[PDB]
Amino acid sequence: MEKYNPHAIEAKWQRFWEEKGFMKAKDLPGKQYVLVMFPYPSGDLHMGHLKNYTMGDVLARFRRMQGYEVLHPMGWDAFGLPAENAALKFGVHPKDWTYANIRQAKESLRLMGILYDWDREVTTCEPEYYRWNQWIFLKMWEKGLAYRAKGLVNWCPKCQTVLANEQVVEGRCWRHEDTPVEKRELEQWYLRITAYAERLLKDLEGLNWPEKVKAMQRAWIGRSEGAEILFPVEGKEVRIPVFTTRPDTLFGATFLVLAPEHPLTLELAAPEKREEVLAYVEAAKRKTEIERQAEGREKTGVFLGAYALNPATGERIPIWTADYVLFGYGTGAIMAVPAHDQRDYEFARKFGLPIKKVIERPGEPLPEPLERAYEEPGIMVNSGPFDGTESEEGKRKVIAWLEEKGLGKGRVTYRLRDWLISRQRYWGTPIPMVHCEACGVVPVPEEELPVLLPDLKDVEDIRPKGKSPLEAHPEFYETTCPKCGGPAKRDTDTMDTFFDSSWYYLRYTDPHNDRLPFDPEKANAWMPVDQYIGGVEHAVLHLLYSRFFTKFLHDLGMVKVEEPFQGLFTQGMVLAWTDFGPVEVEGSVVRLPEPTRIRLEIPESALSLEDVRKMGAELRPHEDGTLHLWKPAVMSKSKGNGVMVGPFVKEQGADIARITILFAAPPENEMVWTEEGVQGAWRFLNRIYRRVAEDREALLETSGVFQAEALEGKDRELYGKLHETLKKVTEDLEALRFNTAIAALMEFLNALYEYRKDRPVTPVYRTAIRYYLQMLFPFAPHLAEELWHWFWPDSLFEAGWPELDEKALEK
Ligand SMILES: CC(C)C[C@H](N)C(=O)NS(=O)(=O)OC[C@H]1O[C@@H](n2cnc3c(N)ncnc32)[C@H](O)[C@@H]1O
Ligand SMILES: [Zn+2]
Ligand SMILES: [Zn+2]
Numbered sequence: 001m002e003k004y005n006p007h008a009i010e011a012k013w014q015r016f017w018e019e020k021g022f023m024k025a026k027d028l029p030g031k032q033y034v035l036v037m038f039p040y041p042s043g044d045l046h047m048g049h050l051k052n053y054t055m056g057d058v059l060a061r062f063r064r065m066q067g068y069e070v071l072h073p074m075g076w077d078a079f080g081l082p083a084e085n086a087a088l089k090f091g092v093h094p095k096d097w098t099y100a101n102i103r104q105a106k107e108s109l110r111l112m113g114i115l116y117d118w119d120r121e122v123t124t125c126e127p128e129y130y131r132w133n134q135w136i137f138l139k140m141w142e143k144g145l146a147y148r149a150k151g152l153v154n155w156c157p158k159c160q161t162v163l164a165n166e167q168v169v170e171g172r173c174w175r176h177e178d179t180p181v182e183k184r185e186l187e188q189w190y191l192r193i194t195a196y197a198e199r200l201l202k203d204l205e206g207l208n209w210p211e212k213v214k215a216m217q218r219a220w221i222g223r224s225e226g227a228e229i230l231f232p233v234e235g236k237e238v239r240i241p242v243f244t245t246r247p248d249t250l251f252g253a254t255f256l257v258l259a260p261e262h263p264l265t266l267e268l269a270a271p272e273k274r275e276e277v278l279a280y281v282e283a284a285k286r287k288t289e290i291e292r293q294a295e296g297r298e299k300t301g302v303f304l305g306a307y308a309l310n311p312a313t314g315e316r317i318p319i320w321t322a323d324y325v326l327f328g329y330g331t332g333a334i335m336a337v338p339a340h341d342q343r344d345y346e347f348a349r350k351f352g353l354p355i356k357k358v359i360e361r362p363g364e365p366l367p368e369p370l371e372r373a374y375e376e377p378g379i380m381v382n383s384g385p386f387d388g389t390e391s392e393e394g395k396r397k398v399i400a401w402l403e404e405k406g407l408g409k410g411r412v413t414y415r416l417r418d419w420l421i422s423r424q425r426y427w428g429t430p431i432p433m434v435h436c437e438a439c440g441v442v443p444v445p446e447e448e449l450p451v452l453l454p455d456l457k458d459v460e461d462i463r464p465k466g467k468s469p470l471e472a473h474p475e476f477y478e479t480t481c482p483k484c485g486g487p488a489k490r491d492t493d494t495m496d497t498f499f500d501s502s503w504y505y506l507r508y509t510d511p512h513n514d515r516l517p518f519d520p521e522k523a524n525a526w527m528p529v530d531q532y533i534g535g536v537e538h539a540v541l542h543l544l545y546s547r548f549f550t551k552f553l554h555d556l557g558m559v560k561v562e563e564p565f566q567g568l569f570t571q572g573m574v575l576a577w578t579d580f581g582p583v584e585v586e587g588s589v590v591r592l593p594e595p596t597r598i599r600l601e602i603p604e605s606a607l608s609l610e611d612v613r614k615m616g617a618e619l620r621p622h623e624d625g626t627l628h629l630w631k632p633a634v635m636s637k638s639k640g641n642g643v644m645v646g647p648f649v650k651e652q653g654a655d656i657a658r659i660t661i662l663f664a665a666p667p668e669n670e671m672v673w674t675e676e677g678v679q680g681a682w683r684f685l686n687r688i689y690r691r692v693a694e695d696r697e698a699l700l701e702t703s704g705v706f707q708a709e710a711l712e713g714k715d716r717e718l719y720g721k722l723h724e725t726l727k728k729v730t731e732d733l734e735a736l737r738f739n740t741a742i743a744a745l746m747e748f749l750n751a752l753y754e755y756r757k758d759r760p761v762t763p764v765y766r767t768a769i770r771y772y773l774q775m776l777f778p779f780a781p782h783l784a785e786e787l788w789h790w791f792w793p794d795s796l797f798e799a800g801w802p803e804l805d806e807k808a809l810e811k
Contacts, residue, residue, distance in 0.1 A: 528564055695761045
C-alpha cells in the first residue's frame with residue numbers, strides 16, 4: 001500500500017484554491033475580519049513569520065467553512081527604516097530590494113498553503129498608498145494634531161535620524177539593539193497623540209486583548225494625579241503657581257525655585273541681589289537645552305532675597321532661581337521638597353536649605369538625619385489633618401482641599417509624549433508641507449497630492465549622513481508657496497514607517513479608492529478586525545499608534561468604531577536550537593570563553609550545570625573536540641538560525657510544517673522548532689493517510705446515510721466520540737487553541753483505528769471520515785483536500801463546517 005506523499009499534491013491544491021478564489025472577500029459582507037501583522041520586506045520569511053501567518057490561515061479557513069464572509073488580507077510594510085536599512089546594508093537600492101523581497105515572501109506564503117484575497121494587496125511604498133498618508137497628515141494639521149516644534153529628540157547614530165520615544169527600547173534603537181540612542185536639539189514634526197491619552201487609556205477596558213498588552217499601554221501612557229499650587233509672595237500681589245505630581249508632599253515644601261528665564265526671577269530679586277541674579281540668568285541662557293537638562297551635573301543657583309508662604313503650613317520659605325528648573329516645563333517654577341525628591345535633596349544639602357519629612361516609609365521609619373530622599377509612597381506625617389493618609393490617596397485629598405480653599409487646582413498629566421514622526425531619511429512618505437519665507441509653514445493643497453518622492457537612483461546618494469537626503473535635491477524642494485505664490489521650499493523630511501502601518505487595515509477594505517483613503521461604507525462593513533494576530537513587541541508601537549489613528553478617523557466621521565482591533569492575540573516566538581560556541585566543564589562549573597559569553601549576551605563567565613539546565617541550554621560534543629553550548633534562541637536572520645520555507649517545503653512539505661508549528665505548544669507560548677516535531681507531524685499525517693487508504697475501497701461502496709438513534713454498540717460509541725471531537729475542535733478553533741484542537745484530532749484518529757478493529761467500514765464510519773477531513777482542513781488543507789477528492793466531487797471550502805449533534809453529547 002502506498003504512503004502519504006506531499007510532493008505533487010500540495011502545488012496542485014494551492015493552484016486550485018487560488019483559481020477558485022475561495023478566499024476572495026466581497027466589497028460588502030455574518031463577516032469575519034481575520035488579520036495578521038503585515039511584514040517588513042527586509043528579508044526572507046522563516047518559520048517564525050509562518051507561525052503568525054499559518055495561525056491566520058487556520059482561522060480564516062475555519063470561518064470561511066462556517067459560511068462567514070471572510071476578509072484575510074496580506075500586504076507589505078515597505079516604507080521606512082526596516083526596508084531601507086536592510087537594502088543599504090547590502091548596497092542595494094531600496095526599491096529593488098523591497099520588490100525582490102516581496103516576490104520571495106509571496107512564494108513563501110503560497111508554498112505553505114496560505115490563502116489571502118490578493119486583490120486587496122497594498123504596498124505602502126507606492127504613491128497609490130502614501131498619497132493617502134499625506135491626505136491623513138493634512139487632516140491632522142487642519143485639526144490641530146500635527147505641528148512643528150524645536151526641542152530635544154532621540155537620535156540613532158547608525159540610522160542617522162531622529163526616533164520617536166516608542167522606538168527607543170531600553171535606551172537603544174529599536175533597529176540597532178547594540179546602539180545607545182543620543183540626544184539632539186532639532187525642529188521636527190509631531191502628531192499630538194496626547195490629545196487622545198485619556199480615551200486611549202479608558203477604551204482599553206472593553207478590549208479582548210491580553211492583559212499584559214493592556215498593562216504595557218497603561219504604563220506607557222502613565223496617567224498621573226497632579227496639581228498646580230499657588231504660593232503667595234511676601235509683600236507682593238503675585239501668587240506663584242507651581243506644578244507637581246506630588247501634591248501629597250506640600251507640607252514638606254521648604255523653598256521655591258524659579259527657572260532663570262521666569263519673569264519673576266528678576267522682578268522679585270532684591271535690589272542688592274539683582275546684579276548676581278542677572279549674571280546667573282545670562283550664564284544660564286548661554287547653555288544649551290541638553291546642558292541645562294543634564295542629570296548628573298553640579299548644583300548651582302541664587303537666592304533672590306524674596307520669600308513665599310507655604311499655603312499649607314503658613315510658613316515662610318525662600319525663593320531661589322536655579323538652572324535645573326526649566327522654564328518651558330509646567331509653570332517654570334517648582335516647590336522643592338528635599339525630603340522626597342533626590343534632586344531637591346542634593347540642592348538643599350549644598351545650599352543649607354531645610355529638609356522636612358512628610359511621607360513616612362512603611363515598616364522601618366526613615367532615619368534622622370535623612371541621608372537621601374525617600375521618593376516612594378508612604379504615610380503622610382507632619383501634614384496637619386492629613387496625617388495617617390496613604391500617599392497616593394493623599395494626593396487626591398490634598399487636591400480637593402486646595403480647590404475648596406482656592407489654593408490650587410488638580411491637574412492630570414501623562415507620561416505619554418507627542419509622537420515625533422519626521423525622519424531624515426529618503427525612503428519614506430514626503431511630508432506634504434511647504435516652507436515659505438513670507439507665509440511660514442503652508443500645507444500642500446489636497447488636490448495636488450501626492451507629493452511624489454524624488455526618484456533617486458544613486459544608492460550612495462540615498463545613504464543618510466545626518467540630514468535628509470532630499471536636502472541635496474533642489475529639483476525636488478524648490479517650489480512655489482501655495483498661499484502667496486512666491487518662492488518656497490518643500491519639507492525635506494519623510495514620515496516614519498509607523499505612520500503607514502497605523503491604518504493599513506482600513507485600506508484593505510477599499511484598496512483601490514483613488515479619491516479617499518477609503519470609503520466609510522466599506523470600512524464600516526468590515527471593521528473592526530475581529531481577530532488580530534501579531535507580536536507583543538508592538539505593544540506601545542503599532543498597537544498604540546493604530547488606536548490613535550482610528551480614534552482620529554472616527555472623529556473625522558469616516559469610521560464608526562473607535563477601536564480597530566476588537567480581538568488581539570499575541571503569538572509566542574518560534575525558537576530554534578542555536579550553537580553559541582565552546583565551553584569548558586570542570587566539576588559543576590561551566591567556563592565560558594569571551595566569544596561564547598558575548599554571543600549568549602550574558603555577564604556570566606561561569607555557569608553551574610544547573611544554570612545551563614535552567615536557561616534551557618545543553619552541552620553537545622562537537623567534532624572540534626570540545627563541548628559547545630546550545631540553546632533555543634528566537635528564530636531570526638541576525639541569529640542565523642532561520643528555517644526558510646522554500647527549502648523546508650521542498651524536502652518535507654507544507655502540511656508537515658503547519659502541523660509542526662500548530663501542535664508544538666499553545667500559540668501564545670514560545671515554541672522550539674525541532675526535528676522531533678517534524679517527525680511527529682510526519683507520523684500523524686502518515687497515520688491519517690494510511691487509515692483512509694486502507695478503507696478506500698470499502699468506503700467507495702458505502703453510503704453515508706444512517707439513523708443515529710438506530711445505532712448500537714461500537715457504532716453508537718463512535719458517533720458520540722465524533723460529535724465530542726467536533727465540539728472540542730470547533731471551540732478550540734474559536735479560542736485559537738490550535739494545539740489542543742490537533743490533539744483532539746489525534747485522539748479521534750486513534751478511536752477510528754480502534755473502531756476498525758471491531759467494526760467494518762459502515763455508514764457512520766464513512767460520515768466520521770467525512771467530518772474528520774472537514775475538521776482537518778484548517779490545519780493540513782492539502783492532505784484533507786486530497787483525500788476528500790477520493791470520495792466527493794466538491795472542495796472542502798464548499799462542504800462547509802460539520803453540524804454538531806447536541807443530543808449525541810448527553811452521557
Ligand atoms: C503591523 C506592522 C507594524 C508589523 C511590522 N511590519 C512587523 O513587525 N513586521 S515583521 O518584523 O516582518 O514581523 C511580522 C510578524 O511576524 C512575527 N514574527 C517574526 N519573527 C517571529 C518568530 N520568530 N516567531 C514568531 N513570530 C514571529 C512578528 O511578531 C510579527 O507579528
Ligand atoms: Zn538605528
Ligand atoms: Zn507664501
